Swiss-Prot record, chain A:
Record's function text: Component of the 26S proteasome, a multiprotein complex involved in the ATP-dependent degradation of ubiquitinated proteins. This complex plays a key role in the maintenance of protein homeostasis by removing misfolded or damaged proteins, which could impair cellular functions, and by removing proteins whose functions are no longer required. Therefore, the proteasome participates in numerous cellular processes, including cell cycle progression, apoptosis, or DNA damage repair.
Protein name (record): 26S proteasome non-ATPase regulatory subunit 7
Keyword Membrane recorded: no
Modified residues (N6-acetyllysine): K200, K210
The keyword Acetylation appears for this protein: yes
GO cellular component, one term: ficolin-1-rich granule lumen
From Swiss-Prot, chain C:
Name of the protein this chain belongs to: 26S proteasome regulatory subunit 6A
Domain of life where this protein originates: Eukaryota
Lineage: Eukaryota, Metazoa, Chordata, Craniata, Vertebrata
Organism, as annotated: Homo sapiens (Human)
Subunit-level organization: Component of the 19S proteasome regulatory particle complex. The 26S proteasome consists of a 20S core particle (CP) and two 19S regulatory subunits (RP). The regulatory particle is made of a lid composed of 9 subunits, a base containing 6 ATPases including PSMC3 and few additional components. Interacts with PAAF1.
Family: Belongs to the AAA ATPase family.
Curated annotation (Swiss-Prot), chain D:
SMART domains per the UniProt record, alphabetical: JAB_MPN
Ranges where the MPN domain occurs: 10-145
GO biological process: double-strand break repair via homologous recombination; double-strand break repair via nonhomologous end joining; proteasome-mediated ubiquitin-dependent protein catabolic process; protein deubiquitination; protein K63-linked deubiquitination; regulation of proteasomal protein catabolic process; response to ethanol; ubiquitin-dependent protein catabolic process
Keywords attached to this entry: DNA damage, DNA repair, Hydrolase, Metal-binding, Metalloprotease, Phosphoprotein, Protease, Proteasome, Ubl conjugation pathway, Zinc
Entries under CDD domains matching the protein: MPN_RPN11_CSN5
Residue positions of motif JAMM motif: 92-105
Binding site for Zn(2+): H92, H94, D105
Entry EC no(s): 3.4.19.-
Modified residues (Phosphothreonine): T245
Enzyme class: hydrolase
Function: Component of the 26S proteasome, a multiprotein complex involved in the ATP-dependent degradation of ubiquitinated proteins. This complex plays a key role in the maintenance of protein homeostasis by removing misfolded or damaged proteins, which could impair cellular functions, and by removing proteins whose functions are no longer required. Therefore, the proteasome participates in numerous cellular processes, including cell cycle progression, apoptosis, or DNA damage repair.
Name of the protein in its database record: 26S proteasome non-ATPase regulatory subunit 14
Modified residues annotated as Phosphoserine in this record: S129, S203
Organism name: Homo sapiens (Human)
UniProtKB/Swiss-Prot annotation, chain E:
Subunit organization: Component of the 19S proteasome regulatory particle complex. The 26S proteasome consists of a 20S core particle (CP) and two 19S regulatory subunits (RP). The regulatory particle is made of a lid composed of 9 subunits, a base containing 6 ATPases including PSMC5 and few additional components. Component of a complex with USP49 and RUVBL1. Interacts with PRPF19. Interacts with TRIM5. Interacts with NDC80. Interacts with PAAF1. Interacts, in vitro, with the thyroid hormone receptor (in a thyroid hormone T3-dependent manner) and with retinoid X receptor (RXR). Interacts with ERCC6.
Section covered of the full-length record: 103 to 153 of 406
Organismal lineage: Eukaryota, Metazoa, Chordata, Craniata, Vertebrata
Protein name, per record: 26S proteasome regulatory subunit 8
Compartments in which it is found: Cytoplasm; Nucleus
Family: Belongs to the AAA ATPase family.
Function: Component of the 26S proteasome, a multiprotein complex involved in the ATP-dependent degradation of ubiquitinated proteins. This complex plays a key role in the maintenance of protein homeostasis by removing misfolded or damaged proteins, which could impair cellular functions, and by removing proteins whose functions are no longer required. Therefore, the proteasome participates in numerous cellular processes, including cell cycle progression, apoptosis, or DNA damage repair.
Modified residues (Phosphoserine): S18
Length: 286, 70, 146, 289, 51
């Protein structure tokens, strides 16, 4: 198991390039490539990637071609350029997995047994996290259900090593937000959080509707986990907490009040100092 | 810009940083610190730094490449 | 202790560099012991016989030395007022006892080139191990004996 | 007589800069090099889209380092994926040395220029370009036979002094005397900035987490204590109000001290931390049951 | 800089790369022979010295 697949900025900026390379002329769906990177305790580091000629057909959803020699030869070159990278998985920008993913993943299992596919939604630019990392597991589904290939999910997180970090920071250099936050940006951080929590809760509702209307299979698992989240709610109405909330809300207001007063006396002092300044210069003009 | 400006200045005190001794002072925002490397360098003084902690033996830190009192 | 060849930038060991005991070290193997035959060193007899007990004899008839248990002292310091001829009987045990006699006078083992005399030392014993029964003679040990 | 107008730009794609910086820091103690893939869109613009590292070799950064077998094959394989670009130049790092070309580098540049009169050569110091600044100057050999005419042979234009001024740490290693710099401009476009913005982007969960109250109360108590001592000076600093040329008093006591700078500066921190924390507290009380 | 100000034993500062003189700088007094200069006048006044 891979606890995390940290996708470095360079990969998602080559995939974007890879999507543009083709889609610009050969209008096509997902662009497939290989993902190189160094291993860690359990967190797979994605540090680079390259494209692999990939052609598919909407018919039979298994007439594809992921070149072997191009994949083999490319990596033959890259291990020369840098030797800390081993093939570790593949990437496709088609937002929704295909029926061809399992079979192709079996191929990339021929180059790295613990192969993780990272879906980069190059086209969308939205709430965030444009990478979704998947593994391959074949289990008996403990709870008495057919076996199958399936793609298990692995937590994805986007990070940066020092070198790319310097390039990225300059690369934006026109839309970066101040790190301090300030009251303006902190609040926007919350209207943003509220929008997400609603958005995540709405994806949950649609699925629950789907299972409710039958259109989807009752997982029987992860379904009650959502029931776990439904019991972990706070129940604020409790009196003993209601008292304890006013105390801390009151504990803070007396600091914003002291903060407010200091900013006021300073304000008046600054007007009195200024009223003297222009007045004194007023008389001194004569 | 001001917040970026302060952040950019705050970036100057990033690590790594060579260590040198505050030999003397020439004037406001400048110094005659002498690096641990073995050579004494006429460097600049970061404003945020306090001119009251620059005692004339102070083991101050100098920017690694630009070699300025930071 | 191995002296390897490494990349000037990366500092990765590239290739082990052969020692060959340099050339100086083998030069200190002078084979022209001037023949200070004990007929040539006089008056220092009990001194002469004593070193033949701790050298020559220990090196030559070692089989009996092994059975007796009497470990033969590997070293013998030659102290005494200058002009006594310490470098002389040393040759006497050097010449009239055969051996290789790698004389490594201490004064020579002062080289401003960092890590040279020390290399000359470890090698000297290293050059010493290669050859057959010999004597590593260091005169004027004060030069490094300080 | 053709001339590289100073307006001429070497466009560096958002991909190339990260990849060129990555290669440089990859072998930072030594010097790395690779060919840059781009198009000579016209005289006044040399566009570089992708770069591919030419494997580090003992020669260093020289013509010999350019392995013809590696380059011919790599180009051939990048043509299938949809990048039929032409070799537009070469880049090599300079572990901290600066953005200049040495004698040996010049000989390389003259070789590349042999195949096309506009093969731009760049640098990329992975040790200096350690913060928001990226030290990457582009360079094209100024053929020595043009000493009769004007060096940097530019013409009608006005962006010569813009975006840079001749850097001193380079003017000494031969500039406007054998190598001239070409303005470097990055072709970042949307759909690429957005994907890079995710580098430090937080998430939905962030902004609703309430901090922790144990260290929040300690922090609130800590800052209020520190601001208190700063009020004591504010009283002494004001209640002094010494009038011996007060305008000079306000300028002989400037050390980033009591009056205001260590004053409400803390008020903003103290009041911003509480307001955000409180608003998060009340939002959670509404959203979560 | 007027060369007339560059007397022998000055402590001019030279630029980082081209080694050009660009300031005269304060004169060098050994780090130990400079702590010997009273910067803080003591607080013993004549009126405390009797007899
Ligand atoms: N027993 C001896 N018989 C004959 N000559 C001797 C005797 N002892 C010393 N000499 C002579 O004394 C001179 C000094 O030589 P040598 O270096 O051996 O003296 P030394 O006492 O060892 O000197 P130092 O102790 O200062 O190194 C030589 O001419 C040597 O032959
Ligand atoms: Mg002697
Ligand atoms: Zn170079």
């Amino acid at each position: 198991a891979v606890q995390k697949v940290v996708v470095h900025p360079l990969v998602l900026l080559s995939v974007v390039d890879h999507f543009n390379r083709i889609g610009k002329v050969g209008n096509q769906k997902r662009v497939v490539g290989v993902l190189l990177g160094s291993w860690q305790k359990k967190v797979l580091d994605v540090s680079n990637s390259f494209a692999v000629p990939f052609d598919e057909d909407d018919k039979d959803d298994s007439v594809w071609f992921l070149d072997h020699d191009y994949l083999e030869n490319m990596y033959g070159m890259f291990k020369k350029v840098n030797a800390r990278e081993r093939i570790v998985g593949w990437y496709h920008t088609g937002p929704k997995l295909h029926k061809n993913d399992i079979a192709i993943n079996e191929l990339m299992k021929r180059y790295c047994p613990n192969s993780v596919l990272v879906i980069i939604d190059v086209k969308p630019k939205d709430l965030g996290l444009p990478t979704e990392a998947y593994i391959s597991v074949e289990e008996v589904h403990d709870d008495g259900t057919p076996t199958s290939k399936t793609f298990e999910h692995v937590t994805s997180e986007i990070g940066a090593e020092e070198a790319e970090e310097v390039g990225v920071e300059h690369l934006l250099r026109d839309i970066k937000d101040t790190t301090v936050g300030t009251l303006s940006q902190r609040i926007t951080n919350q209207v943003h959080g509220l929008k997400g929590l609603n958005s995540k809760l709405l994806d949950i509702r649609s699925y629950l509707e789907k299972v409710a209307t039958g259109k989807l299979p009752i997982n029987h698992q992860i379904i009650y986990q959502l029931q776990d989240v439904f019991n972990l709610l706070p129940d604020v109405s409790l009196q003993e907490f209601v008292k304890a909330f006013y105390l801390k809300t009151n504990d803070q207001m007396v600091v914003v009040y002291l903060a407010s007063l200091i900013r006021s006396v300073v304000a008046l002092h600054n007007l009195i100092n200024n009223k003297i300044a222009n007045r004194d210069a007023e008389k001194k003009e004569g | 810009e001001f917040l970026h400006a302060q952040e950019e200045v705050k970036r100057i005190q990033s690590i790594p940083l060579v260590i040198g001794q505050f030999l003397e002072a020439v004037d406001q925002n400048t110094a005659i610190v002498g690096s641990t490397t073995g050579s004494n360098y006429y460097v600049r003084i970061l404003s945020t730094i306090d001119r009251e902690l620059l005692k004339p033996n102070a083991s101050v830190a100098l920017h690694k490449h630009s070699n300025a009192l930071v | 202790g191995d002296l390897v060849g490494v990349n000037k930038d990366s500092y990765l060991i590239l290739e082990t560099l052969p020692t060959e005991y340099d050339s100086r070290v083998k030069a200190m193997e002078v084979d022209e012991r001037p023949t200070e035959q004990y007929s040539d060193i006089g008056g220092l007899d009990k001194q002469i016989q004593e070193l033949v007990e701790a050298i020559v004899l220990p090196m030559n008839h070692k089989e009996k030395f092994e059975n007796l248990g009497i470990q033969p002292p590997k070293g013998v310091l030659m102290y005494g007022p200058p002009g006594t001829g310490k470098t002389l009987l040393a040759r006497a045990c050097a010449a009239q006892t055969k051996a290789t006699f790698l004389k490594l006078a201490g004064p020579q083992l002062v080289q401003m080139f960092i890590g040279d005399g020390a290399k000359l030392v470890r090698d000297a014993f290293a050059l010493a191990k290669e050859k057959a029964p010999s004597i590593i003679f260091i005169d004027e040990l004060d030069a490094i004996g300080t | 007589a053709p001339a590289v107008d100073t307006a001429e730009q070497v466009y560096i794609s958002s991909l190339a800069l990260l990849k060129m910086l990555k290669h440089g820091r990859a072998g930072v103690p030594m010097e790395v090099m690779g060919l840059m893939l781009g198009e000579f869109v016209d005289d006044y613009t040399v566009r570089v889209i992708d770069v591919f590292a030419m494997p580090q070799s003992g020669t260093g950064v020289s013509v010999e380092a350019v392995d013809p077998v590696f380059q011919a094959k790599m180009l051939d394989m990048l043509k299938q994926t949809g990048r039929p670009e032409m070799v537009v130049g070469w880049y090599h790092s300079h572990p901290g040395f600066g953005c200049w070309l040495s004698g040996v580098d010049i000989n390389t540049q003259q070789s590349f220029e042999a195949l096309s009169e506009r093969a731009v050569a760049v640098v990329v110091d992975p040790i200096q370009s350690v913060k928001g600044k990226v030290v990457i100057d582009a360079f094209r050999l100024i053929n020595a036979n043009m000493m009769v005419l004007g060096h940097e042979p530019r013409q009608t234009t006005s962006n010569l002094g813009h975006l840079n001024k001749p850097s001193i740490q380079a003017l000494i290693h031969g500039l406007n005397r054998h190598y001239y710099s070409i303005t470097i401009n990055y072709r970042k476009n949307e759909l690429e900035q957005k994907m890079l913005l995710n580098l430090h982007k937080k998430s939905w969960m962030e902004g609703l987490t309430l901090q922790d109250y144990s260290e929040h109360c300690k922090h609130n108590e800590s800052v209020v204590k520190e601001m208190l001592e700063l009020a004591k000076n504010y009283n002494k600093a004001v209640e002094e109000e010494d009038k011996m040329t007060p305008e000079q008093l306000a300028i002989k006591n400037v050390g980033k001290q009591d009056p205001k700078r260590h004053l409400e500066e803390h008020v903003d921190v103290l009041m911003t931390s509480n307001i955000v924390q409180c608003l998060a507290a009340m939002l959670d009380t509404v959203v979560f049951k | 800089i007027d060369i007339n100000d560059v007397t022998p034993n000055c402590r001019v500062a030279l630029r980082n790369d081209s080694y050009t003189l660009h300031k005269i700088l304060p004169n060098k007094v050994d780090p130990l022979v400079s702590l010997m200069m009273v910067e803080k006048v003591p607080d013993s006044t004549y009126e405390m010295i009797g007899g």
